[PDB]
Amino acid sequence: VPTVFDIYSRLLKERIVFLVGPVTDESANLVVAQLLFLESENPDKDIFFYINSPGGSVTAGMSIYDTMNFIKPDVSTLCLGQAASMGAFLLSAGEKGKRFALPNSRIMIHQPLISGQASDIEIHARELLKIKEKLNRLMAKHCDRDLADLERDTDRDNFMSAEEAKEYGLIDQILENRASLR
Amino acid sequence: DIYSRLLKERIVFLVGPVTDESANLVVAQLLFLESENPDKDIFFYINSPGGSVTAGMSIYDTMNFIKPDVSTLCLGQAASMGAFLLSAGEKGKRFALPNSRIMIHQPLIGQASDIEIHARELLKIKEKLNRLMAKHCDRDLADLERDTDRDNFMSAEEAKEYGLIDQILENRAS
Amino acid sequence: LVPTVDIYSRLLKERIVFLVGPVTDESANLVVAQLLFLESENPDKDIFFYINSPGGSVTAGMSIYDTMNFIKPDVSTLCLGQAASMGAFLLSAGEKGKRFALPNSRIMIHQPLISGQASDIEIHARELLKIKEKLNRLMAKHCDRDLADLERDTDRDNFMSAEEAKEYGLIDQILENRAS
Amino acid sequence: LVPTVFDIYSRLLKERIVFLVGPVTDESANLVVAQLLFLESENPDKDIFFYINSPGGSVTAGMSIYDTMNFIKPDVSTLCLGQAASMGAFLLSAGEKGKRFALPNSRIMIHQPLISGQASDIEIHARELLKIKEKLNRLMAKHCDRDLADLERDTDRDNFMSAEEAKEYGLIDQILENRA
Amino acid sequence: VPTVFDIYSRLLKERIVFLVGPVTDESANLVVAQLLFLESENPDKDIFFYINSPGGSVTAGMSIYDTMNFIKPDVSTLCLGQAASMGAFLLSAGEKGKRFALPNSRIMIHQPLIGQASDIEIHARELLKIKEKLNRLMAKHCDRDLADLERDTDRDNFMSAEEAKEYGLIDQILENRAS
Amino acid sequence: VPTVDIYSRLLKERIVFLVGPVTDESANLVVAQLLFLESENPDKDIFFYINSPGGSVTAGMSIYDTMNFIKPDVSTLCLGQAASMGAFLLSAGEKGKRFALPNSRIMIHQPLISGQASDIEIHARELLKIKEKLNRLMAKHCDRDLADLERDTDRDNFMSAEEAKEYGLIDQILENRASL
Amino acid sequence: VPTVDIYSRLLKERIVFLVGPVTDESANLVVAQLLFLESENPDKDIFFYINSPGGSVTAGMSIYDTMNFIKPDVSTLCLGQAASMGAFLLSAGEKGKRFALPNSRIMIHQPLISGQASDIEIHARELLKIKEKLNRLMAKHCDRDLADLERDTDRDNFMSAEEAKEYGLIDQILENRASL
Amino acid sequence: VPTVFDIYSRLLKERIVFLVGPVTDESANLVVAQLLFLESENPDKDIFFYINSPGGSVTAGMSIYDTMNFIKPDVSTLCLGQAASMGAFLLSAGEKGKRFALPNSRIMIHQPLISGQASDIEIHARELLKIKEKLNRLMAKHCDRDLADLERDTDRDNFMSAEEAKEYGLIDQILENRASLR
Amino acid sequence: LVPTVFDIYSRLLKERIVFLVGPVTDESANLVVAQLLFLESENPDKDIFFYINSPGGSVTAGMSIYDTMNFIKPDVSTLCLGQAASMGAFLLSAGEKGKRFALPNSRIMIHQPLISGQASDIEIHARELLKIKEKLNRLMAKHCDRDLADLERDTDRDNFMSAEEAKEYGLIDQILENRA
Amino acid sequence: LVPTVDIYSRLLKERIVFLVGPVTDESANLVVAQLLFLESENPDKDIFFYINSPGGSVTAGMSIYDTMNFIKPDVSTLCLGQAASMGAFLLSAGEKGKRFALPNSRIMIHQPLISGQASDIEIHARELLKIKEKLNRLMAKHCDRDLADLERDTDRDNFMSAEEAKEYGLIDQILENRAS
Amino acid sequence: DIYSRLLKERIVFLVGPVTDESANLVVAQLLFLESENPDKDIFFYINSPGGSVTAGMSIYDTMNFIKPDVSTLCLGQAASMGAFLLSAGEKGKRFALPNSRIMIHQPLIGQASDIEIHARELLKIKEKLNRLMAKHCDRDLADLERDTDRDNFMSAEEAKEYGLIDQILENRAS
Ligand SMILES: [K+]
Ligand SMILES: [K+]
Ligand SMILES: [K+]
Ligand SMILES: [K+]
Ligand SMILES: [K+]
Ligand SMILES: [K+]
Ligand SMILES: [K+]
Ligand SMILES: [K+]
Ligand SMILES: [K+]
Ligand SMILES: [K+]
Ligand SMILES: [K+]
């Protein structure tokens, strides 16, 4: 990581935080920690959360989501490359009006998928369906859409261009260069 | 071979895990014995820890389909599907040797939509087997749900009291 | 590890043929060979095809299906244990009026599954979708059902009891014993 | 693992039926060669029935069967069941013209050759592969009564065909639904 | 396996049945099948059950044990090489007066050995029931007190043929066709 | 890594490297260097040196959109090779500032890849969307017609520096700082 | 193996097969068949069918010396392929009775292989002795000059049946029993 | 193995015995058993021992050697393909005057090679050297040569053509076809 | 694992020494590229000393170094220590003429390219490999002041050379025994 | 896992360089780099090269050897533990009069060891034999011994005590302490 | 780091197996400590099961070569080459902690010609180490051959009586 500080620590001084690759407990908590630090540095200035992720752990992603909502600074989100599954959930969770994608980003949403005794399978199946239901409800809220839309649109993999994600309510604006924003 | 010779005495064995292959071999022997003589008892000796539910159901439904009475005998152990099949023997002709042990328990083992479908199917299987075992044991479904929630080991005498077998045989003095 | 009197050859004399376990080229062709043999021994007598299978290769299954329909004897089918996917397809393909299940059999139906360059992925995706359509049209015919029902009812795994399979049109009768 | 009757495949050999099932290997191909030579020796004046359910395999092992078919006196009638892909399709199309058949739900697939050191050696083996590619196209066009350029176009990528499409192409002569 | 009949089927004509190596469901049931076959052949003649086994599955061993007592023929036992754990249990289960060992055989006896806490509890309890029943039956075979067997199986207990005769596990040691 | 580290020292000269496979992590490191250099001075050119066989399409698009997004012109330099997504990024450099060294090689091709039919259908459609979008963008980079890119990427297409320049993928070949 | 076993039945017709790699065991089985046929009748031709990619040089020499040792002429037939030691044995057949089918292929090359310098020296010298001896024998089989074989086996040399015949490796190409 | 008897059992009726591939306890004892059987069938008729072997276990080879010397029938030996190490030892052990090779056979002789505490290594090293010495002495006897020749000529791998093996004393005659024998 | 002085290789970089050790990979080659670019930036008027002990590796990674050597202003003097084989020899011979050296017991080896799908793809990649083979021969003949046909002859198989033989060939200019 | 005051860098200040374990390109080049560094720090002061190595790559060892002889400082060598094969070669290559061993060191010398097509095996066998001759000539010079002695004495592994190595000419003195 | 700090107190550790790398790290620390002060004692703490003979000899010869006295201390265990090095400490300054254990034993580990060469070398090594240990212990070579034929475990007191160490230290009260 090229020092100049290492490059990512240098960009954190500009209040940029990256989520790259799969969402795990460790990658999620490092994002969380940066969020908490930037709030400590300045609780009123925007934070810029750059997401390039295929998704990953649901609980790890929820640690990021809840921290984004907790802290005082607005967390603006930007998809580069892709935001799929939990990546898309988090992209759509950015401060409304400050959710962005670059022109050739790809977004994808879908229902939960997973890798004992019948009693235990019942317990975990019921929990998995509650998780599916909660994510559809939260996403509907982010997207300003009907819950029935999210139930329909996550039954199988739903790949979206940047424009399709904006029309869906998942992001607010597509930025090709600086000139954009409106 | 020894097992072919004993088939001539109308003896059929279930030994070791219940698989599609081991179950169907039992099914074929049952159908053969019925073809040779549809009216004479068959002796089904079970020493098995269980295995596949559908493979076991192929044996169960064959036992009930064919004309011969299928007498069952537990030697060593009959656990899970082994115990189900032991209890399925013709009533009055279900036996265990004195130091046999029985064990009964509930069934064991993508997208959320698919997990839901399969969990539902597993719970349907669990209830059907409990209802069928209750019928074999002349007990209630609620007793079987109770008593199979975790592994439930039974001696021969305990199995007889429960209704899974009719008699314990030390020797031919019934 | 077969007993000898072998048992499956002895039962082939009673015109009984088994499909047990996954459908592969080798397991399917052994069935084909038995069907052709039985037709050779007597072309007018029914054959009894006992099925306990989770399915497998579609093309291997189609070799069985087309042989069942080609040969002169009626092929009666019996599900014991389970008939899932291609197994269910074959169970439903037996001579109408002679498709049976034992009472605690399980049937399951679903759409095709698969467990390079974009051009080639395109060619193979199109072929898998053609297979999906053909099997729905064929199953709808076996079941005396509408294509739109089969398309719907196979989108995900669809488990059926013996009585549900009868109501659906996949089998004709449930047999509890030799008095049904 | 084969039923006894005295082995079922040997029993069907008495009916002049020869199977090719699964991948074409030196050993599986020579087994077909051996059966063809045997059937010709037993009676050179009766057709042989070559049933194919194969995804293909080694080109050279396939040519050993091909040249044997054409060498011996009997007409080798071919039948596709399940599938005949790559070398399997080549051999299906090589059956005596007028005696090439498919069952209704069999599928055919044709394509150009595939393979799964020093530059001088890469050159040598590459040259041989393209020689195989051109030869097989020339022979397939001959089997299909088609122009070489059609086969060149149609074998660049995997080309799947239903029995009706394969008949229209010239690879088979007739589709058999049953004994009618 | 050489042929004459293969060698073991030929010795079945002498009513000799072998248990060799680890006791498994499959090895145990093959023994049961031979015992049942010999009883059908002649229920009034003794069977000679030669044991060279380190032990194995308790339930597989019990299937042989109960069959030995179930069938009409006397089941004479002979240890060659070793009879350890379940092998020793089966050796001592022979018809009393007809349990034998060769002079350099070795016998060994010991106690049985091998999820959610609830399941561990269930299985530990079953293993301890196994422990008590096995001690109860061995004391019966050896004509000893339950407390002796409890004491003497807490850890591995190796016994010579003479020691095994002294304990009550066998009746006679055979060097030649002696007795 | 020699220390002054060598890559940070060259970052001072606005040199950024893409070496080896394009992954989420290697692509994002480039993005961070591009963003950093923009912060340091938004009007001076950046020199993006590429020796890469390709890799992830979406990881590469993250580099692409960043190149087009920031104010600095991103000049590209192929050294060794620029294949697939590497060649894509070489061609995305600011028109007039795309270069290769004389024995560099470029290669272009259509996308490559290494469940249920419904899902296979969804991903096949998305892959063909990717193929079309990339052909559309490359045709623009090269000031060529889409049908030329469709034709010219059906299989691996290797190009010398001189061939890549004529194609419109690069602007100039640089032997030294006097070939400009 | 179909039963009459198929290979024993063809052994009655003095047909012996070499299929797949030449190993000590496959080579010695051929030797035993050749010796047996000599015992049955020492004056009638033997037909040695070869579909082999080669294998062990010494195992192959055991076949060679046996062919030359026994009284019967050993006619050879290449089907599929005869490569390396396989082609060597094809060419060792009784001159005038070496054949190939029309789409057979032959390949020839120099020996291939897959400690202390003193030992490496010993085995390198023995391998070059093998190379020379085999080139010397092949030149004789083909009625050609040694320098031609040295030149023509430096790398893999693939030959059609027509090319192998012109070379002197085979005598005739057989389409059927009328091409003779 | 083509029945006609299987082919090798058929050739055993003509008193032909094969050793093919590596010499192991099991392959050696099967050769031994055939030797004992043929002696039982007829103790005065020659036996023909065809050898195509790279060698193998020294003790297993010695079981063959000693059985060949024990039984009443002469054991004539024939190398086809190759006879290396213990294969060569056994080839050279055939009845003198009846040791043969086909024209392109290869023979090879060499000293023993092999795949704890120093005391144990000493014991096994001393045994290995005794084995080396005994094989050189026995081979010298088979070859009618000086022991010093065998010590020299087995220090490293010594590959021999059929003619070189005949001149060495290892075989008696090379047979190209039936006409040979003398 | 490098001694501290501030790292030893960085310390020798202060003396304008650059090492290539072991296989040429994208990452090891770009590390050399980076050091060359750094040394030119620090002082374009001083020679760089490129010490090579390498068995070769990726041709394209080697070309990235080659083109950089020729691109930058400094003379890149090369020195063989231990060995320079394949791409290592190519780069050694590419040093500024008059400044190519070997130590007395170093060894050089040159050879043609090596490599360690569908026939259409085999053709494409084979064609590129032979293009690499001809290009490298043309460039080596240029480095060695020799005729192309000499390099064609002399690189067909592994060609090992002592320092004195490599000097006579034209690959190096002088052998250095010590500082004299 | 080095202690810090790191220890090997601290001892490099006293002009001590270690070779420990197998000789590889990387371990040899680290030594070369230290030798060149020490020469740079002071070209007239002795360097102390401590060797505990079983040997390894000949070409990597030759890179060390030629650097020892090239640089201006005398390189004194010290064997501790063992110096086997290339380690012994390097121990013996130290400045004459300044080659030492500790009293319980072990030295061992032997001929080279190595742990495709006949043509290539020939080329490489010839190169291994050239290496064998060069190392014998060079060791004979270091030891002030005849080539015929080194040829003889390296045919198999030859272990030497410190006193035997002195008598042989490989070292000059055995050092028991700083009073020898 | 902790070990760098203790090196400042002239403490050097041998922990775990003796390898070329672990031995040479010890050698380098010994030479460094001598360079810093050639006259002050060095404290070499050994907890080792042994390992490579030649790697151990590199330490041994360095201990004897450098000017500083090398005091040795066994903590935990010193077995095989660990025990050899413990006994090699400057006489009068070889120590063990009270529950240390020592163990001594003989050395442990192609063509017949090569096996002969290496077996001979192994037996030469065995005798040299026995002669050297005898010297350290003020014992006879024949005692050491006797007493190392198989693993010979010794307590601290047994090791002191044998001559491998001089004193057992419970604390600084020598
Ligand atoms: K916030
Ligand atoms: K019944
Ligand atoms: K029909
Ligand atoms: K024909
Ligand atoms: K009894
Ligand atoms: K830009
Ligand atoms: K002949
Ligand atoms: K004899
Ligand atoms: K330059
Ligand atoms: K010097
Ligand atoms: K000292």
PDB file of C-alpha atoms in Angstrom, chain G residues 8-136:
ATOM      1  CA  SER G   8     -11.154 -65.680 -26.510  1.00  0.00           C
ATOM      2  CA  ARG G   9     -13.689 -66.268 -29.296  1.00  0.00           C
ATOM      3  CA  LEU G  10     -11.723 -64.018 -31.643  1.00  0.00           C
ATOM      4  CA  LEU G  11      -8.533 -65.746 -30.564  1.00  0.00           C
ATOM      5  CA  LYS G  12     -10.041 -68.778 -32.272  1.00  0.00           C
ATOM      6  CA  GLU G  13      -9.823 -66.784 -35.526  1.00  0.00           C
ATOM      7  CA  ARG G  14      -6.153 -66.071 -34.866  1.00  0.00           C
ATOM      8  CA  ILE G  15      -6.922 -62.437 -34.030  1.00  0.00           C
ATOM      9  CA  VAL G  16      -4.729 -60.924 -31.239  1.00  0.00           C
ATOM     10  CA  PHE G  17      -5.209 -57.380 -29.914  1.00  0.00           C
ATOM     11  CA  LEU G  18      -2.831 -54.723 -28.609  1.00  0.00           C
ATOM     12  CA  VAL G  19      -4.937 -51.908 -27.177  1.00  0.00           C
ATOM     13  CA  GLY G  20      -3.768 -48.985 -25.110  1.00  0.00           C
ATOM     14  CA  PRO G  21      -0.374 -48.510 -23.545  1.00  0.00           C
ATOM     15  CA  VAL G  22       2.314 -51.113 -23.968  1.00  0.00           C
ATOM     16  CA  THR G  23       3.232 -52.307 -20.471  1.00  0.00           C
ATOM     17  CA  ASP G  24       5.081 -55.386 -19.259  1.00  0.00           C
ATOM     18  CA  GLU G  25       1.698 -57.052 -18.602  1.00  0.00           C
ATOM     19  CA  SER G  26      -0.109 -56.072 -21.805  1.00  0.00           C
ATOM     20  CA  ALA G  27       2.942 -56.977 -23.883  1.00  0.00           C
ATOM     21  CA  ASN G  28       3.333 -60.355 -22.193  1.00  0.00           C
ATOM     22  CA  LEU G  29      -0.340 -61.192 -22.726  1.00  0.00           C
ATOM     23  CA  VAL G  30       0.230 -60.671 -26.435  1.00  0.00           C
ATOM     24  CA  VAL G  31       3.345 -62.860 -26.318  1.00  0.00           C
ATOM     25  CA  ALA G  32       1.275 -65.641 -24.700  1.00  0.00           C
ATOM     26  CA  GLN G  33      -1.435 -65.393 -27.395  1.00  0.00           C
ATOM     27  CA  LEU G  34       1.191 -65.482 -30.157  1.00  0.00           C
ATOM     28  CA  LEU G  35       2.808 -68.520 -28.557  1.00  0.00           C
ATOM     29  CA  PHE G  36      -0.559 -70.220 -28.155  1.00  0.00           C
ATOM     30  CA  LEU G  37      -1.537 -69.673 -31.785  1.00  0.00           C
ATOM     31  CA  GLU G  38       1.825 -71.070 -32.879  1.00  0.00           C
ATOM     32  CA  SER G  39       1.118 -74.169 -30.808  1.00  0.00           C
ATOM     33  CA  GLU G  40      -2.326 -74.501 -32.414  1.00  0.00           C
ATOM     34  CA  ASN G  41      -1.031 -74.287 -36.006  1.00  0.00           C
ATOM     35  CA  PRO G  42       2.469 -73.019 -36.930  1.00  0.00           C
ATOM     36  CA  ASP G  43       1.812 -72.281 -40.618  1.00  0.00           C
ATOM     37  CA  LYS G  44      -1.371 -70.157 -40.630  1.00  0.00           C
ATOM     38  CA  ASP G  45      -1.121 -66.358 -40.479  1.00  0.00           C
ATOM     39  CA  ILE G  46      -1.821 -64.427 -37.280  1.00  0.00           C
ATOM     40  CA  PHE G  47      -3.635 -61.079 -37.444  1.00  0.00           C
ATOM     41  CA  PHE G  48      -2.256 -58.629 -34.848  1.00  0.00           C
ATOM     42  CA  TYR G  49      -4.578 -55.675 -34.429  1.00  0.00           C
ATOM     43  CA  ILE G  50      -2.929 -52.548 -32.973  1.00  0.00           C
ATOM     44  CA  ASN G  51      -4.589 -49.502 -31.445  1.00  0.00           C
ATOM     45  CA  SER G  52      -1.927 -48.248 -29.140  1.00  0.00           C
ATOM     46  CA  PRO G  53      -0.164 -44.949 -28.331  1.00  0.00           C
ATOM     47  CA  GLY G  54       3.019 -46.761 -27.397  1.00  0.00           C
ATOM     48  CA  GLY G  55       4.589 -47.458 -24.056  1.00  0.00           C
ATOM     49  CA  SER G  56       7.609 -49.374 -22.785  1.00  0.00           C
ATOM     50  CA  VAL G  57      10.384 -50.031 -25.288  1.00  0.00           C
ATOM     51  CA  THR G  58      11.534 -53.252 -23.623  1.00  0.00           C
ATOM     52  CA  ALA G  59       7.973 -54.527 -23.219  1.00  0.00           C
ATOM     53  CA  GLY G  60       7.481 -53.870 -26.920  1.00  0.00           C
ATOM     54  CA  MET G  61      10.690 -55.610 -27.868  1.00  0.00           C
ATOM     55  CA  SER G  62       9.336 -58.712 -26.133  1.00  0.00           C
ATOM     56  CA  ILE G  63       6.422 -58.650 -28.604  1.00  0.00           C
ATOM     57  CA  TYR G  64       8.810 -57.953 -31.549  1.00  0.00           C
ATOM     58  CA  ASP G  65      11.210 -60.781 -30.835  1.00  0.00           C
ATOM     59  CA  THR G  66       8.270 -63.145 -30.371  1.00  0.00           C
ATOM     60  CA  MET G  67       6.771 -62.083 -33.711  1.00  0.00           C
ATOM     61  CA  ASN G  68      10.050 -62.722 -35.474  1.00  0.00           C
ATOM     62  CA  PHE G  69      10.773 -65.887 -33.517  1.00  0.00           C
ATOM     63  CA  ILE G  70       7.617 -67.942 -34.165  1.00  0.00           C
ATOM     64  CA  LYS G  71       6.922 -69.651 -37.478  1.00  0.00           C
ATOM     65  CA  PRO G  72       3.560 -68.036 -38.339  1.00  0.00           C
ATOM     66  CA  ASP G  73       3.622 -64.829 -40.301  1.00  0.00           C
ATOM     67  CA  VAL G  74       2.269 -62.062 -38.088  1.00  0.00           C
ATOM     68  CA  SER G  75       0.105 -59.754 -40.162  1.00  0.00           C
ATOM     69  CA  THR G  76      -0.477 -56.413 -38.494  1.00  0.00           C
ATOM     70  CA  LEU G  77      -3.482 -54.124 -38.669  1.00  0.00           C
ATOM     71  CA  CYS G  78      -3.519 -50.569 -37.411  1.00  0.00           C
ATOM     72  CA  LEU G  79      -6.959 -49.448 -36.266  1.00  0.00           C
ATOM     73  CA  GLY G  80      -7.409 -46.045 -34.661  1.00  0.00           C
ATOM     74  CA  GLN G  81      -3.748 -45.329 -34.157  1.00  0.00           C
ATOM     75  CA  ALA G  82      -0.334 -46.915 -33.909  1.00  0.00           C
ATOM     76  CA  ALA G  83       2.067 -44.499 -32.233  1.00  0.00           C
ATOM     77  CA  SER G  84       5.673 -44.874 -31.169  1.00  0.00           C
ATOM     78  CA  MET G  85       6.217 -48.476 -30.104  1.00  0.00           C
ATOM     79  CA  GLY G  86       2.776 -49.257 -31.518  1.00  0.00           C
ATOM     80  CA  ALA G  87       3.915 -48.025 -34.935  1.00  0.00           C
ATOM     81  CA  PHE G  88       7.154 -49.900 -34.385  1.00  0.00           C
ATOM     82  CA  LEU G  89       5.202 -53.166 -34.020  1.00  0.00           C
ATOM     83  CA  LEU G  90       2.877 -52.355 -36.923  1.00  0.00           C
ATOM     84  CA  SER G  91       6.013 -52.020 -39.094  1.00  0.00           C
ATOM     85  CA  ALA G  92       7.466 -55.299 -37.736  1.00  0.00           C
ATOM     86  CA  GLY G  93       4.665 -57.307 -39.300  1.00  0.00           C
ATOM     87  CA  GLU G  94       5.510 -59.774 -42.020  1.00  0.00           C
ATOM     88  CA  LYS G  95       6.417 -57.703 -45.069  1.00  0.00           C
ATOM     89  CA  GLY G  96       3.444 -57.737 -47.437  1.00  0.00           C
ATOM     90  CA  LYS G  97       0.972 -58.296 -44.568  1.00  0.00           C
ATOM     91  CA  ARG G  98       1.138 -54.893 -42.845  1.00  0.00           C
ATOM     92  CA  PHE G  99      -2.159 -53.039 -43.144  1.00  0.00           C
ATOM     93  CA  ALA G 100      -4.086 -50.023 -41.930  1.00  0.00           C
ATOM     94  CA  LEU G 101      -7.704 -48.937 -42.215  1.00  0.00           C
ATOM     95  CA  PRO G 102      -8.294 -45.722 -44.167  1.00  0.00           C
ATOM     96  CA  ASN G 103      -8.660 -43.284 -41.227  1.00  0.00           C
ATOM     97  CA  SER G 104      -5.973 -44.913 -39.078  1.00  0.00           C
ATOM     98  CA  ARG G 105      -3.008 -42.755 -38.113  1.00  0.00           C
ATOM     99  CA  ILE G 106       0.587 -43.692 -37.383  1.00  0.00           C
ATOM    100  CA  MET G 107       3.136 -41.668 -35.478  1.00  0.00           C
ATOM    101  CA  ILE G 108       6.854 -42.163 -35.054  1.00  0.00           C
ATOM    102  CA  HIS G 109       9.441 -40.453 -32.878  1.00  0.00           C
ATOM    103  CA  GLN G 110      12.698 -40.909 -30.985  1.00  0.00           C
ATOM    104  CA  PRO G 111      12.708 -42.340 -27.464  1.00  0.00           C
ATOM    105  CA  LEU G 112      11.254 -40.341 -24.595  1.00  0.00           C
ATOM    106  CA  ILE G 113      11.753 -40.510 -20.855  1.00  0.00           C
ATOM    107  CA  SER G 114       9.784 -39.369 -17.839  1.00  0.00           C
ATOM    108  CA  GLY G 115      21.233 -39.261  -9.469  1.00  0.00           C
ATOM    109  CA  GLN G 116      25.003 -38.832  -9.664  1.00  0.00           C
ATOM    110  CA  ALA G 117      26.600 -37.643 -12.889  1.00  0.00           C
ATOM    111  CA  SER G 118      28.299 -41.072 -13.315  1.00  0.00           C
ATOM    112  CA  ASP G 119      24.899 -42.766 -13.334  1.00  0.00           C
ATOM    113  CA  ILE G 120      23.242 -40.095 -15.469  1.00  0.00           C
ATOM    114  CA  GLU G 121      26.057 -40.721 -17.965  1.00  0.00           C
ATOM    115  CA  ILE G 122      25.389 -44.480 -18.013  1.00  0.00           C
ATOM    116  CA  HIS G 123      21.658 -44.089 -18.631  1.00  0.00           C
ATOM    117  CA  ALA G 124      22.066 -41.333 -21.215  1.00  0.00           C
ATOM    118  CA  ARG G 125      24.439 -43.591 -23.184  1.00  0.00           C
ATOM    119  CA  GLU G 126      22.022 -46.535 -22.983  1.00  0.00           C
ATOM    120  CA  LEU G 127      19.150 -44.289 -24.155  1.00  0.00           C
ATOM    121  CA  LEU G 128      21.161 -43.108 -27.190  1.00  0.00           C
ATOM    122  CA  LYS G 129      22.000 -46.758 -27.907  1.00  0.00           C
ATOM    123  CA  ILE G 130      18.249 -47.444 -27.841  1.00  0.00           C
ATOM    124  CA  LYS G 131      17.582 -44.534 -30.180  1.00  0.00           C
ATOM    125  CA  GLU G 132      20.131 -45.800 -32.674  1.00  0.00           C
ATOM    126  CA  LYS G 133      19.074 -49.436 -32.511  1.00  0.00           C
ATOM    127  CA  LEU G 134      15.412 -48.526 -33.024  1.00  0.00           C
ATOM    128  CA  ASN G 135      16.225 -46.213 -35.938  1.00  0.00           C
ATOM    129  CA  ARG G 136      18.310 -49.011 -37.453  1.00  0.00           C
TER     130      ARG G 136
END
